[PDB]
């Protein structure tokens, strides 16, 4: 119960599965230029107004 | 190395040493078409260097001392084992076919290097443009599987696109019955096990797929069995050809320089032959490859480079 499942579940497997899920989410882009430049525009919009990086 | 971009810049052009006699000729035919001596005749009339047909031990003769390596070190296949039982469970047929095709690629690279470096034409026999036909026979008789055909097609597609077709191709037309009679008169007991259907399928894929697709990018010279016994007609027909087709016409010095750069690097030439696609015929395990490689390393003249072997009598090693 403890040292073969639960102690093996809370520490290593949670971060392992989280890193796997984040790696699949990040690298699932379609490779389209239009979406990338739209993300660039959204980044500029966020930096200009919401984060006040121009101050 | 010996030839580099600095040599091309300094003045060593390629088209300056290429005369009209520099022609690449591939003599083709059936198993016992008699071309094997006939091409040699074309070697001694046009003044062209002759290359014998690339067998299993072509690379063994090319490098080292020239003696053939044992079959466990080079090839790992036997032509007689294929001739006895072509449907063997160990996948000897496709392994032999792949090794023969890679050896033919090495031979074609050597011939192109000699032609582009010396300006003297080379006479070949059954080059890489006419090897897949043999493969087709191995597929028509059920000797191998479809995955072998797919792997061979992938290797051919990624390899042959960086080379050039020969200037002249000569095909010797010998019927299947005469081929079988010549095989029976040869006396080799392993060659008597060849079925008539295999030779018939070889002739069919020669006349149906190779020659119709090959005559656009070069010039064909189809000859009968009787005409191939007299080389005077062959050399007279070769000497009066009007070369107008093929990709050899639109070649500058830059294209030939790039071709010579790619060709003279042998590992670059044989880079794509061993693609990491796992097939039962060609995949060798870790322990077997380790054992064979360690036994190959301890051979005389193979442990170090071609000039740093003290066990064969190479001197001044400490000043090299």
């Amino acid at each position: 119960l403890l040292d073969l499942i639960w102690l093996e579940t809370i520490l290593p497997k949670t971060i392992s599965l989280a890193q796997m899920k984040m790696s699949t989410t990040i690298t699932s882009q379609k490779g389209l230029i239009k979406l990338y430049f739209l993300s660039f525009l959204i980044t500029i919009l966020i930096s200009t107004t919401l984060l006040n990086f121009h101050e | 190395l010996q030839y580099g971009p600095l040599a091309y810049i300094l003045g060593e052009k390629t088209t300056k040493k290429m005369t009209e006699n520099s022609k690449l000729i591939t003599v083709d035919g059936n198993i016992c078409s008699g071309k094997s001596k006939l091409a040699k005749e074309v070697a001694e009339k046009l003044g062209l260097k002759h290359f014998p047909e690339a067998g299993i031990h072509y690379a063994d003769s090319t490098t080292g001392d020239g003696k053939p390596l044992p079959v466990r070190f080079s090839g790992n296949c036997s032509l007689e084992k294929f001739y006895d039982d072509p449907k063997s469970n160990d996948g000897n047929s496709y392994r032999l076919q792949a090794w023969l095709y890679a050896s033919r690629l090495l031979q074609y690279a050597d011939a192109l290097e000699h032609l582009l470096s010396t300006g003297q034409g080379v006479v070949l026999e059954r080059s890489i443009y006419s090897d897949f036909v043999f493969l087709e026979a191995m597929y028509r008789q059920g000797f191998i599987r479809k995955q072998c055909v797919d792997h061979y097609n992938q290797v051919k597609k990624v390899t042959v696109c960086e080379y050039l077709p020969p200037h002249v191709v000569i095909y010797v037309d010998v019927p299947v019955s005469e081929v079988q009679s010549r095989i029976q008169k040869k006396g080799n007991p392993h060659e008597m096990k060849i079925t008539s259907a295999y030779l018939q399928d070889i002739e069919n894929v020669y006349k149906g797929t190779f020659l119709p697709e090959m005559s656009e990018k070069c010039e064909v010279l189809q000859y009968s069995a009787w005409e191939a016994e007299d080389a005077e007609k062959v050399v007279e027909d070769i000497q009066y050809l009007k070369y107008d087709k093929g990709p050899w016409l639109d070649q500058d010095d830059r294209k030939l320089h790039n071709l010579r750069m790619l060709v003279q690097d042998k590992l670059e030439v044989l880079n794509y032959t061993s693609i990491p696609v796992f097939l039962p015929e060609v995949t060798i395990g870790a322990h077997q490859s380790d054992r064979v490689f360690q036994e190959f390393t301890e051979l005389p003249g193979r442990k170090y480079r071609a000039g740093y072997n003290e066990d064969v009598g190479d001197k001044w090693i400490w000043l090299k």
Binding site: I33, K34, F37, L38, F40 | -
Partner: protein, 98 residues
Amino acid sequence: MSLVYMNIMMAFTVSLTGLLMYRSHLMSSLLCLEGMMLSLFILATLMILNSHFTLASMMPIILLVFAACEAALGLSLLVMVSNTYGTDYVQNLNLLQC
């Protein structure tokens, strides 16, 4: 500042948001690039002529030269594209997704 400065900066931002959202056509993005270059040229020469910085009058025209140093280059990056595919759509440029 003044008023024409505000209008030229608004034109630059308009051409910028025109560029950053593609409409499945490469020539339109090249036209947007030329428009942003023109807006930068106009703003630069407006400031220079207002401030009487005479020795910087070499700046904009020379700047304009380097416009072609990408713009014509963009056309040379299109013809191979138009030799790879029959059209010049940007959705055909998705082979590098694996």
